């Protein structure tokens, strides 16, 4: 059949996808800006397709309910055919790779610790040994799942702590986790992907810091339904953009070129 | 048909694959040790196959001759059906991904600079602006090809320098590049994968250093012939080993646990 416009699913998460300040004046894909907006355009240019950016209906990345076996989030949109491709800060994981296809990584990352400046914490082990400084994750997604599933002693101890800590240590959004770090006078540390930690460290009021080594070594990938023809071309496009240096330029653009916390 | 023993191709490169000191007493896969030997065993355990380790006949990673269109190295062994899987420090690249399949990365790496301690160089830009300190790469493989193909101004200038520098700045093996750094009194710097640089920095006589940021962000992958059934299972195995923390333990084992240059 004839070519059809490709339906892209993504999520509003700065600096990946944001509504432009003047979005009300605009229409279609032009309403949005960010790293993943630019990445989508570069992939589409290389692969020769037209596309429509859509925002995932349920605000989730992708997990399977143990009872109903239903997949939610952007992964679910692909599984059920509601989108053709997901272009987002979506972690490549085994359980997702069993049900959708991922490109090779377009970013590298790992779980990391965000502190308010001056907090006396340098590592996950430091957090795990104490309770005065509370710590947690998003309430959905791969960071939470890392702790829930870990059999590594330190991380399993951290999960047991997080499940039982009061008040709740989980947050609904990145913005909520960052604000909680900023408002808690050093008594909350936030476990989040290193990419996001690095971005926030260069945002005013310049009161957060990434500390410690990353806890793991993962990647974000572009996702397509299993067996999708688009998958081969998109994978090769990611590799080409990486090899040309364009992914490095794009991260610099959205993370550092307009950093707010000095040179 | 019945299951058959899987033919693995690999390459002798420390610390990935080495003949054991007592190899003459041993036979079969037990003759070898290293990171990729252990990785092969872990993948085979998870996927449930028996295998034979073989050493790539031509000593190469994988490139295509522009005239004959023939693929050499471990990639070629897969393309031509002489091996079933390659388990080695083999970089995921676009041109290889067009002809073979790669798992998701089992290691992350980028091109990096090795100096003799005390050499007044901190970056690729520093190298590119001068000629007193000579610099080069392996004479085959992805590091050389990065420079040959780069359209980035600094790296293209470095390639033009390397092609014309005298005496030749290229080396045949990692051991030769390391020895050249060690023997050249600061007048040779070696461009090599960060993984190898990190390994050598913890080897006696403890006279080399990794300097500067990495020039790129890549991965090593396990390779199979295009469309091979083994590919899906091996990809999921890599993801599982990563998610269990086993790849991190394996790098620590072969890089740092017996490092020779202190704690
Ligand atoms: N990439 C994850 C989702 N996610 C994200 C952040 C995080 O700190 N933790 C997390 O889990 C920050 N941006 C996305 C997934 O794919 O579930
Ligand atoms: N991974 C490369 C081969 N290679 C290697 C090293 C290097 O410094 N440069 C390079 O090119 C060190 N160990 C392998 C490929 O796949 O061609
Ligand atoms: Cl259409
Ligand atoms: Cl927004
Ligand atoms: Cl057999
Ligand atoms: Cl050896
Ligand atoms: N997949
Ligand atoms: N491939």
From Swiss-Prot, chains A, B:
PTM description: Palmitoylated. Depalmitoylated upon L-glutamate stimulation.
GO MF annotation: an example: immunoglobulin binding
Extracellular side: 120-263
Disulfide bonds: 206-261
Phosphoserine modifications at: 150, 184
Keyword annotations of the record: Cell membrane, Disulfide bond, Glycoprotein, Ion channel, Ion transport, Ligand-gated ion channel, Lipoprotein, Membrane, Palmitate, Phosphoprotein, Postsynaptic cell membrane, Receptor, Signal, Synapse, Transmembrane, Transmembrane helix, Transport, Ubl conjugation
Functional summary from the UniProt entry: Ionotropic glutamate receptor that functions as a ligand-gated cation channel, gated by L-glutamate and glutamatergic agonists such as alpha-amino-3-hydroxy-5-methyl-4-isoxazolepropionic acid (AMPA), quisqualic acid, and kainic acid. L-glutamate acts as an excitatory neurotransmitter at many synapses in the central nervous system and plays an important role in fast excitatory synaptic transmission.
Assembly mode: Homotetramer or heterotetramer of pore-forming glutamate receptor subunits. Tetramers may be formed by the dimerization of dimers. May interact with MPP4. Forms a ternary complex with GRIP1 and CSPG4. Interacts with ATAD1 in an ATP-dependent manner. ATAD1-catalyzed ATP hydrolysis disrupts binding to ATAD1 and to GRIP1 and leads to AMPAR complex disassembly. Interacts with GRIP2. Interacts with GRIP1. Interacts with NSF via its C-terminus. Interacts with CACNG2, PICK1 and GRIP2. Interacts with GRIA1 and SYNDIG1. Part of a complex containing GRIA2, NSF and NAPA and/or NAPB.
UniProt-recorded name of the protein: Glutamate receptor 2
Organism: Rattus norvegicus (Rat)
Gene giving rise to this polypeptide: Gria2
Range covered out of full length: 413 to 796 of 883
């Amino acid at each position: 059949g004839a070519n059809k416009t490709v339906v892209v699913t993504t999520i509003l998460e700065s600096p990946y996808v944001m509504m432009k300040k003047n979005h009300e004046m605009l229409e279609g894909n032009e309403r949005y800006e960010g790293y993943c907006v630019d990445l989508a355009a570069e992939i589409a240019k290389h692969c020769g397709f037209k596309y429509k950016l859509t925002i995932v209906g349920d605000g989730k990345y992708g997990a399977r309910d143990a009872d109903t076996k239903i997949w939610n989030g952007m992964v679910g949109e692909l599984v059920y055919g509601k989108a053709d491709i997901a272009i987002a800060p979506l972690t490549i994981t085994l359980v997702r790779e069993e049900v959708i296809d991922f490109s090779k990584p377009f970013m590298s990352l790992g779980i990391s610790i965000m502190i308010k400046k001056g907090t006396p914490i340098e590592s996950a082990e430091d957090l795990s040994k104490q309770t005065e400084i509370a710590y947690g994750t998003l309430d959905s997604g791969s960071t939470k799942e890392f702790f829930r599933r870990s059999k590594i002693a330190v991380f399993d101890k951290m999960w047991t702590y997080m499940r039982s800590a009061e008040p709740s240590v989980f947050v609904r959004t990145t913005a909520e986790g960052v604000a909680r770090v900023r408002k808690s006078k050093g008594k909350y540390a936030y476990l989040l992907e290193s990419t996001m930690n690095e971005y926030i460290e260069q945002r005013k009021p310049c009161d957060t810091m990434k500390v410690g080594g990353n806890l793991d070594s993962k990647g974000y990938g572009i996702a397509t339904p299993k067996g999708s023809s688009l998958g081969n071309a998109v994978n090769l496009a990611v590799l080409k953009l990486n090899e040309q240096g364009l992914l490095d330029k794009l991260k610099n653009k959205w993370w550092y070129d307009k950093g707010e916390c000095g040179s």
